[PDB]
Amino acid sequence: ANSIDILQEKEGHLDFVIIPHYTFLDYYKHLSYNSIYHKSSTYGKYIAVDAFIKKINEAYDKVKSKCNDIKNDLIATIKKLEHKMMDEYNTKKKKLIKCIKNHENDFNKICMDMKNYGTNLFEQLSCYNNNFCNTNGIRYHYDEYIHKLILSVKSKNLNKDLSDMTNILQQSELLLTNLNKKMGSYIYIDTIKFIHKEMKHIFNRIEYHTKIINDKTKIIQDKIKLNIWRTFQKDELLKRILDMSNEYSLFITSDHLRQMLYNTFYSKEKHLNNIFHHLIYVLQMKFN
Amino acid sequence: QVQLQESGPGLVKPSETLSLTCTVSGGSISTYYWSWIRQPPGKGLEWLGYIYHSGSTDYNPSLESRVTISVDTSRTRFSLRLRSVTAADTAVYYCARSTTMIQQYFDYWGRGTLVTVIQMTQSPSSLSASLGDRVTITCQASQGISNSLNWYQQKPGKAPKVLIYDASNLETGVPSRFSGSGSGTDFTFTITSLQPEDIATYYCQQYHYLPLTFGGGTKLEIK
C-alpha cells in the first residue's frame, strides 16, 4: 500500500521491493522447507520446492516488468539530476508508485498461490506418534538456511556501519553549507544537495531495517533453543513451525533490504565523491 | 487425508438448472482452487470452471455464461449450478482441486456422479500393446504452452489422476516407468515398459492459457 523500498545498488539501476510481499513469500518459503524436512522420506522434495519458488519469482518479476517504462523514465530523470527538474523527479516517482498499486491484485494472486503451496506441504505433515513429534525438521532447516545468516549479522556490528554513515552525511552537510556560505557561485551545487537529500532518506531506511535485524537476531536465537531437541504434540509442533517461519521471514526481509539499501547509499556516495574530485581539482587549478 | 464427494440430482429435465455439490472432507477449502470437470459418456474431459482464493472465479467460455460455482466455506462445500441444460450436458461430473495457477495440476478428484439430462490434440486415441512394450503418446497444443503440461491416468471407472505435472516431473509416488517430456508445442508421454496395472485412458492437460483444456485421451488396452 505504502511500504515500497526504492533501490539503486548500481549506476542507473533502479528497482523496488514491496516490503509486505517480500515477508509473505519468505514466510511460505520457510513453511515449505520445514514441512518437507520434518521427515527424511520427504527431504528430496526440496528440488520441487526450489523449482516452484523459481516459478513464483519469475511470475512476480513479470508483473513488476509491466511498470518498466515508468521505472526507466525515472532512471533517465535521476541520471540527468546526477550531473532544475527536481519537481519532475517527484512526479515520475509518484507515477511509478501509482502503477505498482494498480498491479496490486496481479501480485496478490502470485502471493496467494505461494501461500497455497506452502500450506499444502504444511498440511501433509506426518508424525509417527502425534504426542511425540520430532523437531528434526526445525533444526535441519534452521542449521542450513537460517543459522549462517545469524552468525554473519552477529559479526557485522550494524550499529558501527550506521555511525560511519552519519559521519558521511555530516561531512557532506558541512561541505554543502561551506559552499553555500563561502563560494555558492559553483556548478553542480544543486546536484550535491539532491544526492545528499536522497542519501539522508536511504540512511533512515537502513536505520529502520538494522533496528529490526538487531532484535530479530536475539528473538530467533532465543526461540530456536526451545524448539530444537524436544518432541511436541502435533498441534504444538505446527504452532512452532509457523512462529519460527514468521520470525525468520521478518528477519530475512529487513536483512536483505538493509544490505540492498547499504549498496545504494554507497553507490550514491560514489557519484557524490566523483563531484567532490571535480570540486577539489577546480579549486586547485584556480589556486594556480 | 483430503477427500472430495459429489452429491447431486443425477437426472435433470431439459432447460432446468443442474445443481451438484461437493463435500470437502478431511481438509479445508480455504484459498485453494475448486473446479468442476465433466466427462460425457465415452468422451473426454471438459473443465467447467473453478472458485479460488477469496472467492474469485474463472469459467470456460464454452459454457456460455450459464455456469456458477459458489462456496459456503463454513459448510466446507462448494457447488455447481448449470442453467438451461441440454442432452449435451449429460456427463459424469467430477468435483476436483488444484493448489495454484503458477504450477497448476489436480491434487484431488471426487468419485464423480453421472447426471443424465488451446487445442490439445492427443495423437494415439487408442492403443493396444502387449505387456512389456514401450508405449509412447503425443500431445500437441494449438500454440506456445512452455512446460505448462500435465498428464493424468484415468483407470477404468475411476477419476483421472496426476502422473506428471509441468511436462516432465513425476508426482511423488508415481512409478518411474512413466516419463514426461517436451516444451512449447510438442509433448510426449511414455511408459517404458507396459504393466497390467496400466490399462487405463491417459489424458494431457494445459494450464498456460486460462480456459483449461484436456487432450483427446489414449485408450490403452492389452493385445
Number of domains chain A is built from:
1
Closest residue in B to A52 (Cα) is B103
Residue-range definition of the domain harbouring residue A177: 4-286
Per the structure block, which three cell numbers stand in for A106?
496481479
Asked if A55 reaches chain B (Cβ–Cβ under 8 Å), the answer is yes
Residue B14 C-alpha, separation from nearest chain A C-alpha, in angstroms: 38
Q: How far is CA A152 from the centre of its chain?
A: 16
Q: Are strands B126-129 and B218-222 parallel, antiparallel or unpaired?
A: parallel
What residues contact A63, with CB distance under 8 A and at least 6 apart? A103, A106, A107, A110
B107/A120 CB distance under 8 A: yes
> Mutate which of B99, B170, B172, B176 to disrupt the A interface (most A C-beta within 10 Å)?
B99
Asked if B99 reaches chain A (Cβ–Cβ under 8 Å), the answer is yes
Which amino acid is located at A8 in the chain? Q
Domain residue spans of chain B:
3-115, 121-214
Per the structure block, which three cell numbers stand in for B155?
483407470
The CATH homologous superfamily for domain B3-115 is Immunoglobulins (2.60.40.10)
What Å resolution does this PDB entry report? 3.1
What CA–CA distance (Å, rounded) separates A214 from B59? 49
What CA–CA distance (Å, rounded) separates B93 from B20? 8
Count of pairs with CB atoms under 8 A, one residue in A, one in B: 34
> Mutate which of A49, A116, A123 to disrupt the B interface (most B C-beta within 10 Å)?
A116
Per the structure block, which three cell numbers stand in for A119?
500450506
Q: Can you list the pairs that B170-176 forms with residues at least 24 positions away whose Cβ atoms lie under 8 Å?
A: B171/B105, B172/A45
Closest residue in B to A109 (Cα) is B53
Per-position DSSP letters for A222-246, written without gaps between them: HHHHHTSS-EE-HHHHHHHHHHHHH
* Phi, then psi, of A38 in degrees rounded to 5: -50, -45
SS3 A6: strand
Alpha-carbon dihedral sign for residues B192, B198, B202, B206? negative
Q: How far apart are the first and last CA of chain A?
A: 56
Of the candidates B27, B31, B172, the beta carbon closest to that of A116 is on B31
A114/B101 CB distance under 8 A: no
What CA–CA distance (Å, rounded) separates A280 from A171? 15
Cβ neighbours around B195 below 10 Å, total: 11
CB B122 within 8 A of CB B216: yes
Per the structure block, which three cell numbers stand in for A237?
509442533
CA B61 to each of CA A96, A220, B47, B65, B71: distance values in angstroms, whole numbers, following the listed order: 35, 50, 10, 7, 21
> Burial, B90: exposed, middle or buried (Cβ in 10 Å; 0-12, 13-18, 19+)?
middle
What CA–CA distance (Å, rounded) separates B149 from B103? 9
What CA–CA distance (Å, rounded) separates B135 from B130? 10
Sheet order of strands, B135-140 included: B121-122, B135-140, B186-191, B178-183
The one-character DSSP state at A192 is: H
> Burial, A213: exposed, middle or buried (Cβ in 10 Å; 0-12, 13-18, 19+)?
buried
Residue B136's beta-bridge partner residues? B190
Element (H, E) at A18: strand A13-18
What CA–CA distance (Å, rounded) separates A6 from A64? 13
Q: Give me the helices (H) in A14-102, please.
A: 19-37, 46-64, 68-81, 86-102
A33: number of CA atoms within 13 Å, CB side? Answer: 21
Burial B11-30 (b: 16+ CB within 10 A, else e): ebeeeeebebbbbbeebebe
Alpha-carbon dihedral sign for residues B115, B116, B120, B124? positive
Which conformational region is residue A131 in: left (phi greater than 0), alpha (psi within -120 to 50 degrees), or beta? alpha
Helix axes A234-286, A147-156, angle to 10 degrees: 40
Residue B96's beta-bridge partner residues? B35, B109
Per the structure block, which three cell numbers stand in for B173?
509416488
B45: number of CA atoms within 13 Å, CB side? Answer: 34
B100/A117 CB distance under 8 A: yes
What CA–CA distance (Å, rounded) separates A20 from A1? 9
- Which technique was used to obtain these atomic coordinates? X-ray
* Phi, then psi, of B79 in degrees rounded to 5: -140, 155
> Mutate which of B31, B100, B105 to disrupt the A interface (most A C-beta within 10 Å)?
B100
Of the candidates B27, B102, B107, the beta carbon closest to that of A113 is on B102
Q: Which residues of A touch B172 (CB under 8 A)?
A: 45
Q: Can you list the pairs that A91-100 forms with residues at least 24 positions away whose Cβ atoms lie under 8 Å?
A: A93/A6, A95/A70, A96/A16, A96/A67, A96/A70, A96/A71, A97/A4, A99/A66, A99/A67, A99/A70, A100/A4, A100/A16, A100/A18, A100/A67
What CA–CA distance (Å, rounded) separates B195 from B197? 5
The one-character DSSP state at A5 is: E
3-state secondary structure chain B: CCEEEEECCCECCCCCCEEEEEEEECCCCCCCEEEEEEECCCCCCEEEEEEECCCEEEECHHHCCCEEEEEECCCCEEEEEECCCCHHHCEEEEEEEECCCCCCCEEEECCCEEEECCCCEECCCEEEECCCCCEEEEEECCCCCCCCEEEEEECCCCCEEEEEECCCEECCCCCCCEEEEEECCEEEEEECCCCHHHCCEEEEEECCCCCCEECCCEEEEEC
- Domain B121-214 sits in CATH at 2.60.40.10
Nearest to B134 by CA among B56, B193, B69: B193
A115/B103 CB distance under 8 A: no
CA A160 to each of CA A163, A204, A216: distance values in angstroms, whole numbers, following the listed order: 5, 15, 18
Nearest to A257 by CA among A192, A207, A196, A185: A207
3-state secondary structure B184-216: CCEEEEEECCCCHHHCCEEEEEECCCCCCEECC
For cell 509457523, what's the residue?
A242
Cβ neighbours around B35 below 10 Å, total: 27
Helix, strand counts (H, E) of chain A: 10, 4
What CA–CA distance (Å, rounded) separates A275 from A191? 9
CB B183 within 8 A of CB B208: no
Residue B25's beta-bridge partner residues? B3
* Phi, then psi, of B21 in degrees rounded to 5: -120, 155
> Burial, B126: exposed, middle or buried (Cβ in 10 Å; 0-12, 13-18, 19+)?
exposed
Domain B121-214 in the same topology as domain B3-115: yes
What residues contact A171, with CB distance under 8 A and at least 6 apart? none
The one-character DSSP state at A14 is: E
State the maximum Cα–Cα separation within chain A, in Å, rounded to a whole number: 86
Element (H, E) at A7: strand A4-10
CA A186 to each of CA A62, A190, A278, A283: distance values in angstroms, whole numbers, following the listed order: 44, 9, 11, 10
What residues contact A161, with CB distance under 8 A and at least 6 apart? A210, A262
